[PDB]
Amino acid sequence: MFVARSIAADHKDLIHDVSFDFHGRRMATCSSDQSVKVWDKSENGNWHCTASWKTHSGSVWRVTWAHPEFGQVLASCSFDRTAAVWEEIVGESNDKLRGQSHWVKRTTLVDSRTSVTDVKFAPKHMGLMLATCSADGVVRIYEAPDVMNLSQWSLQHEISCKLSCSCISWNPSSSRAHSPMIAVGSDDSSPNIMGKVQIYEYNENTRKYAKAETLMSVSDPVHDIAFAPNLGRSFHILAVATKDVRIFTMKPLRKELSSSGGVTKFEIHTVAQFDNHNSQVWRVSWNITGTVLASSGDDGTVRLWKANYMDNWKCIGVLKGD
Amino acid sequence: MLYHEHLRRDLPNTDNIHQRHPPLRGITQRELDGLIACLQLTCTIIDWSESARLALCEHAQWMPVVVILGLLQCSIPPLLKAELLKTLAAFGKSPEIAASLWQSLEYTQILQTVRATGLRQGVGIEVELNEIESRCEEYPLTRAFCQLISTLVESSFPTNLGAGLRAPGFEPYLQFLRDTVFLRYRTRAYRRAAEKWEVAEAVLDVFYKLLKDYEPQPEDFVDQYVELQGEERVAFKPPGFSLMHHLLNESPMLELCLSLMEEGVTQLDTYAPFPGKKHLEKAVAYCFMLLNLTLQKENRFMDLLRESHLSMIVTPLEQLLQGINPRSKKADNVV
Amino acid sequence: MERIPLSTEKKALKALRICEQRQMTEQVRSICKTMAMQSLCNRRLGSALSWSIRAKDAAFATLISDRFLKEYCERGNFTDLDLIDNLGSAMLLSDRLTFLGKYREFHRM
Amino acid sequence: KLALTSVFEGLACKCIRLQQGGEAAQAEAWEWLAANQLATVITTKESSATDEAWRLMISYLDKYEAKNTLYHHCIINKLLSHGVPLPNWLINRYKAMDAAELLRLYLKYDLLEEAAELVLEYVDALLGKGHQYFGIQAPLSATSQLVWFPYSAIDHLRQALGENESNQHNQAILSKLQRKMDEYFQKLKKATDDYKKLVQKPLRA
């Protein structure tokens, strides 16, 4: 029996995203009220708002934690066309300012021409990198060259998707046999545009991200995308939130030694398609092992999906808020 | 550069079979002797000074490698082409330049490595050897090409040679050196009796270098497939594998090596001086060194072949040396 | 192993022992960097340096070393003299750490 | 108070000799590199002596800015005289400082392809695409300051690309360049006509 717990988020408007820290002891929430809030889990399992500040001049669409090796770093993105990076200064602020002051805005990334719809830190083995996607159809990848100086972020890569970008996912695979990959989703409502999920692979020879694949079977608007954590699989798994939940496996085809600079070709299979929300699916998230998928939709439910030992995916749980 | 630009403007476009044009304004003999002297001075300086070799090759205005390779495609005298190839060989002593020269040799098709189905008239060194050098009874271009290949093999061996144009590997150059140069050197006319041995030395030096550094790996005994233009083709085996395969079978190459050792000892048994003695002695020495490298690597090569799924049979070199010599009609190779 | 909350140095050392027994070098490095960064954020430069040395991270060691030097320029003395005195072969990890160590040797002399 | 030009030429010559030199030249290079204050030699096991020689050059260009592009010009002219491909970082810095002098340097060394790519990018920069890479504060508008267009050097490039009628590649470059020049002249005509209209609205204030 899953126990739902209400948290009085005290946001003045709609909450767009919720992100846990790497240890699952802190969470960040972001809202149309232009604010980010941080919440800490006490030993009794209660949640307490430990910081609340205005971050942006428009609705905050996403919030993400960096890996704890880079310290206590948050990124937020907004309708105001910016992404902001925040660092928590852990220090003795004398016992009178426990309300709001330990999060410092280190930078504002302003290169995007329209709404920045999603923001994701890269896997830690790539360094302190931040991807942003914008409705202008561009993914921008920034790097902080010095973790001690989070005020400086260099634009390393610009990826033209040629579609309005709605969501991004880094492939978390630490395998040196796999070039760094990013999946990009599009919320474009045009029925004439097939392939609203695009996969980009970093090509070492060109020092650029090149389009490896396009999921032509995904013609519906994409609201969220997530690569599953790769704990020793010879293939990738990608979840896609659209009118339904889709799960794709992507097996890299062995590079025939004859294409001296090609992107990796993938053998792609749809291993699951679930219409059980009977409505649009807004979010998809993998467990840390990449074995259980959570999805949320307009049906007001969170659904849990898991493969059995025959690779048959099933709904294993439904959580409903009261 | 001025000679490269002038000689390239006069290359006939393939569509006009009808009008007698007046004689080519050829390089004068004095200009030829001047160009040869300049190339020989250039070769000598870059042969001894690595800093001069790098500084001349990287010179953005002169582009010496591009100009020299471009002149090799023009209709110039074979002596000038031979000195141009020696200048490239002297540049190819530095490993940084040698890797770029391998790519440039494949792009320029000075040796035809890509056979298109339909052209029955080959352009390049194989036709110059068979039509020009063979008529002059002198082989300076073929020797200078063997010297370039000998220097490039010593400084850099590229595994991906010809990747994207053909199946990767050295095999087209090995076929030219083996089948067109070495197996035919005895059947050719020579104005200088010594040059017969200079050609044999120059090709055997390349084979010795290719076999010296080659160690049998398990990967050499597996057929690797490479996609080219939408067809799967088998990749070429390393040149040392091909040399071992020909030396460990009843091949024309092994027979030619054994008969060169017989010709060598038969001339030495005269105790008389003869033209090209020093070059015959070296060519025989490279044949000995090849057989000795074969005997040293034979056990490992045969064990890996036996572990592999290749339908290839190979005979111990020591048993092939007991073969009937086709010349004496006796088993006298060991003698 | 990387997701274990490291609230105390004891817990971190236990996790490290387990990782070392099983030859998990990447996790060891990651855990040490996390502790080094945490210590650094808590203005404990000595502990941060110790964890950085264990992580064999030259870049991070250089960074912590620059902070020691900056603190010296501001205060005129080093806060953690004992650790810097016992750097041994660890001094070779980075040029800046080597400098810091030799500079201290100068003051000792 | 001597000119630093001989120092930059000699360092450029050592970088070229290192890039053309075998393992022996790389071993000898650590001795003279150590004799110069690289304030940050982290001996990571992955940097070649050639990479550190180029880092030294970058650090000297940053420490010793000449008022006139003389040191960058001198290094580029030296690299091109040895036929060495120009590093992208040096090209990008010099594009931001003086793209017209760079075009003349490529033309002086018959680098017609790189000269044509530079002109295509400079024309795109004037049209408003990538203007930041060329130090151009404002793209071609009715109110922007007049950027000097190196028309004579571009006409020499068009002549040099045109003298070789046999090279289908040079004609493809020349047609790409002409089409881009026409796009520029059309936008220039429009911006000039819109400037004339801005000047022809009567002062009612």
Q: What string of DSSP letters covers B64-129?
A: HHHHHHHHHTS---HHHHHHHHHHHHHHTTSHHHHHHHHHHHHHHTSS--S--TT--S--SHHHII
> What stretch of H or E contains B265?
helix B252-268
Min Cα–Cα distance to chain D from C94, Å: 7
| Pairwise CB contact (< 8 Å): C37 & A147 | yes
D43/C contact by beta carbon, under 8 A: yes
Rg (CA), chain A: 20
CA distances from C73 to B124, C91, D140 (A): 73, 21, 51
d(CA A213, CA A265): 7
Distance, CA of B123 to CA of B111 (rounded, Å):
8
Chains in contact with A via at least 3 Cβ–Cβ pairs below 8 Å: B, C
For residue C62, the chain D residues in CB contact (below 8 A) are 42
Long-range contacts of B275-281 (CB under 8 A, 24+ apart): B275/B192, B275/B193, B275/B194, B276/B192, B276/B193, B276/B194, B276/B195, B276/B196, B276/B197, B276/B198, B279/B194, B279/B197, B279/B198, B279/B200, B279/B201, B280/B197, B280/B200
In degrees, to the nearest 5, what angle opens at C-alpha B229 toward C-alphas B226 and B234? Answer: 25
8 A C-beta contact, residue A112 and residue A140: yes
Q: Which of A69, A72, A174 sits opposite C33 (nearest CB)?
A: A69
User: Rounded to whole angstroms, how far apart are CA atoms A175 and B57?
Assistant: 41
Which helix (H) or strand (E) covers residue B247, if one does?
A: helix B239-247
Nearest CA in chain D to B92: D20
| Interface list for A 244-283 with B (CB within 8 A) | 256-260
- Phi and psi, residue A167, nearest 5°: -160, 155
User: For an interface test with D, which of C95, C97, C98, C99 has the most D Cβ atoms less than 10 Å from its Cβ?
Assistant: C95
Q: Which residues contact C74 (CB under 8 A, 6 or more apart)?
A: none
- Do C and A make contact via 3 or more CB pairs under 8 A? The reply is yes
Q: Do D17 and B55 touch (CB under 8 A)?
A: yes
Closest CA to A30 of A6, A51, A14: A14
Name the nearest CA neighbour of A186 among A240, A149, A147: A240
- CA dihedral for B185, B191, B193, B194, sign (positive or negative): negative
The reply to whether residue A257 touches residue B228, judged by beta carbons under 8 angstroms, is no
Residues of B numbered 218-237 whose beta carbons fall under 8 angstroms of chain A's beta carbons: which are they?
A: 224-228, 232, 235
**B57 three-state secondary structure:** helix
Quote the CA–CA distance of A87 and C41 in Å, as a whole number.
11
Report the alpha-carbon distance of residue C5 to residue B325 in Å, rounded. 81
Contacts of D42 in chain C (CB under 8 A): 58-59, 62, 94-95
Integer Cα distance of D153 and C2 in angstroms: 61
Helix (H, G, I), strand (E, B) or coil at A291: coil
Which of B223, B227, B236 would you mutate first to test chain A, the one with the most A CBs within 10 A?
A: B227
* Chain C touching partners, 3 or more CB pairs below 8 A: A, D
Backbone phi, then psi, for C61, in 5-degree steps? -60, -40
Integer-rounded Cα radius of gyration of chain D: 22
Q: What is the 3-state secondary structure (H, E, C) of chain C?
A: CCCCCCCCHHHHHHHHHHHHHCCCHHHHHHHHHHHHHHHHHCCCHHHHHHHHHHCCCHHHHHHHHHHHHHHHHHHCCCCCHHHHHCCHHHHHHCHHHHHHHHHHHHHHC
Resolution limit in angstroms? 6.9
Give chain D as a 3 state SS string.
CCCCHHHHHHHHHHHHHHHHCCHHHHHHHHHHHHCCCCCCCCCCCCCCHHHHHHHHHHHHHHHCCCCCCHHHHHHHHHHHHCCCCCCHHHHHHHHHHHHHHHHHHHHHCCCHHHHHHHHHHHHHHHCCCCHHHHCCCCCCCCCCCCCCCCHHHHHHHHHHHHCCCCCHHHHHHHHHHHHHHHHHHHHHHHHHHHHHHHHHCCCCC
Distance in angstroms (rounded) separating the CA atoms of residues A268 and A250: 5
CB A244, CB A237: distance < 8 Å: no
CA atoms within 13 A on the CB side of B294: 26
How many Å apart are CA B180 and CA B253, to the nearest integer?
Answer: 12
Residues of chain B neighbouring D83 (CB-CB closer than 8 A): 57-64
Question: Residues of D with CB below 8 A from B51's CB?
Answer: 17, 20-21, 25
Q: Which residue of B has its CA nearest to D24?
A: B50
CB of C3 closer than 8 Å to CB of A22: yes
Question: Which of B86, B109, B84, B96 has its CA nearest to residue B57?
Answer: B96
Residues 86-105 of B with CB under 8 A from D: 94-97
Burial class (CB in 10 A: 0-12, 13-18, 19+), A289: exposed
Task: Say if D42 is an interface residue toward chain C (CB within 8 Å).
Answer: yes
- H-helix or E-strand spanning residue B296: helix B277-307
Subunits in contact with chain D (3 or more CB pairs closer than 8 Å): B, C
Tokens read off for B294: 């074969």
CA distance D42 to chain C (A): 6
A232 close contact with C: CB closer than 8 A: no
Quick check: C95 contacting D, CB < 8 Å?
Answer: yes
Give me the amino acid identity at C4.
I
CB of A68 less than 8 A from some CB of C: yes
Report d(CA B259, CA D185) in Å as an integer.
76
- Token pair, residue B297, equals 């690597």
Reduced to 3 states, what is the DSSP secondary structure of residue A184? strand
Query: Is chain C adjacent to chain B, meaning 3+ CB pairs within 8 angstroms?
Result: no
Of B204, B180, B176, B183, nearest in space to B113 by CA: B176
**SS3 (DSSP) at A69:** helix
Residues 6+ apart with CB under 8 A from B41: none
Which residue does chain C place closest to A127, by CA atoms? C30
Residues B307, B299: Cα–Cα separation, whole Å: 12
- Chain C and chain D share a number of CB contacts under 8 A equal to 9
Give, in order, the Cα–Cα distances in Å from A110 to each of A24, A80, A134, A170, B22: 30, 9, 11, 21, 70
